[PDB]
Chain length 119, copies 8
């Protein structure tokens, strides 16, 4: 086998302040967050036996909480904060986070920033 | 040449019980399964030539039957169960299974669990 | 640089006979073809400075003509044939062909078969 | 960590002249561009401190300006032109560009050309 | 003003037996139900004060119950059974029900039946 | 009761020759057919039960056969031919037919022609 | 001419509290609002002439402010409040408001409430 | 019968300047035009004998030429202009024009203006 269980939180849609421009700081913007988390496949089947358990519900709760109650200057800062929150649990082997800033550029669907973490 | 034929079963849509919370155990939930199976490309051209053939139809029938006729505690148990069903045939070189649990997280399209197997 | 120009022929939608069952042989089924072709990046810019260039229009023409005017017993035979048609040209470094047999399994969007070739 | 911040400019939809055939040169055709850019993750969190930063807004600006105000003979020339525009900034580690020529083939959604650069 | 509150139950996705042919009676098929119910606008602003109220939840519960736990020979019968269930509440002025039998015709996304009731 | 049962044949996708221009006559084009047919609601609960049943399956079979096995000079002619075929059954009260000529105009999704019949 | 200009505000996506159940009151839900406003077509052109013009921007502003900054007991109250906000201006001849409470019924895409006003 | 042929030009996607604000006048915006035209059904079948015929290709050609080569202050003006170009031909019984101004309001897919003409 390939001992890596992958958890995907697809299209978490939130709104928050990103940017320094008058408008950007005055109105919330639409962003789409996608999180990919890797962790040992054996501990996965163990999810119910032990309570250290990685809870995607908690990861999401935290991300939502942190994003909605803050103002951000750069996409980079935001993407990092969420990455840190995703790889917080000690089972996390690898974690990746992509954030789409919807309609940030005119004539394009979005621009996204993706950051990852190893070990 | 890269001697691996890949079969994908795209968006098998089913309903079953997943969870322990009253609601979860009382109501079936929507899940979407995706199966990726790899096997020797040479034997692929021999699929009406050899009876010990890999039948994606059977694989599907089994999965459906197993999933619709049970109650599961965690996505992990369910995903593994299916992975085992996918990689049951002796030609299976590699097998992957991703299961989306639709609208499990509020404000998110879904959360999915992917597991795989080698050799 | 990474000297490999990738050409993608997206969702070539065709109808043809696939199967041995009475219905399958009596009615054309929908299939979606997706072809990925690689070839040297340098020759790409010089595709118009000679007279034997890779023509995605011809490849497509041949695939259509070959797929619509025939009957196929198995997905694998059909996929291989197309892959052959794809890598026919002497510039092709690599070629991949995925063919979706739409609504082949009930409750599933489709099932596809992928095959590739190197060197 | 995996020191690479990825920036994606998704579906930049533009119209321009591609081809030599009368119709091609008399009427603009629809294209969809997708740009993927990689650069050092550490500098990413330093996008305000270090003022000569990588600006996706500028990259897009140049691409649009360059594409909407020119005529192209081959998809390859155009794709390359954009690729160069993308990897123009000195932080660019890797860059990939895919360009879809919408409805270039009949019976197919589109045909795309993808080109990338390293180091 | 125009004293009619319109409640719409959008895409209620269910599976059941529809048909007489061996296959149709052996495998449940996918159907999508849409329900439109009109009722006095003035009474609408009172469903929190009174308990003789129109509960879209009860309507749904009954439809699901009735459709999943039964077998149907004709779309018309099924559509009528549902129409009666929807207009059962004494507040209902108008009621319309459409039922799509997904992929019932080959080469057509679906075929639907719509029936309505007045007074 | 508003005694009018409505049958909708949704998105019947076919290919056939439309036009007089060389290309139009040399290559089949994609068209999307939508048929709406009205007939008595009372007789509707009767097809298994009562006689000369309106078989949406026979109507479609006839449309497909006639469309695919011919060449048409104008959309209008084609839409009429289908309309006639659709209102051929003696129970038909009303019949409507919209035909999309996919990507007929550049820059637009499609152009359609709608024709209907009464009594 | 048919002297009625129609302004549509399509898919205004907002989140607010709707319901009385513990979960509905503790967590905001996703609703999609659609507004249809009619007014004399002649006055519409005199818009770059007069000052008391109908401003869809202001209407939206008010709808957003009112919806996000409050809690609602029933869909009916929310829809009415919005309807009133929509027909506030003296040019409005007819006003219609549909509100989708996304995934309010399990197994259904949404449930909506539409209300309208005349004169 | 119901002697009214309906021609729909679906989603004509164009870019042009709309508004008075610095940004709006400096950058073209995305608009989607939808045109609906009615004309006598009898004349429709004779749209191949005569040549003073209603040509949807000309209508579209005219629409585009006028839209792309001008600047508009108000949606109302733009929509009227298009409505006029569509009902220009003497066969036109009724004409309708809906214009979506994509992402005009923040938090909404768009805002559209519809205008129609009779006789």
């Amino acid at each position: 086998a390939q001992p890596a269980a992958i958890i995907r939180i697809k299209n978490l849609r939130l709104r928050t302040f990103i940017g320094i421009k008058e408008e950007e700081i005055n109105n919330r913007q639409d962003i789409v967050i996608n999180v990919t988390i890797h962790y040992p496949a054996d501990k996965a089947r163990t999810s119910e036996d032990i309570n250290d358990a990685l809870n995607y519900r908690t990861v999401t709760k935290n991300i939502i909480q942190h994003v909605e109650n803050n103002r951000f200057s750069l996409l980079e800062k935001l993407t990092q904060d969420v990455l840190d929150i995703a790889r917080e649990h000690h089972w996390v082997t690898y974690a990746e986070v992509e954030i789409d800033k919807l309609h940030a550029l005119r004539y394009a669907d979005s621009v996204s920033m993706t950051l990852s973490w190893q070990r």
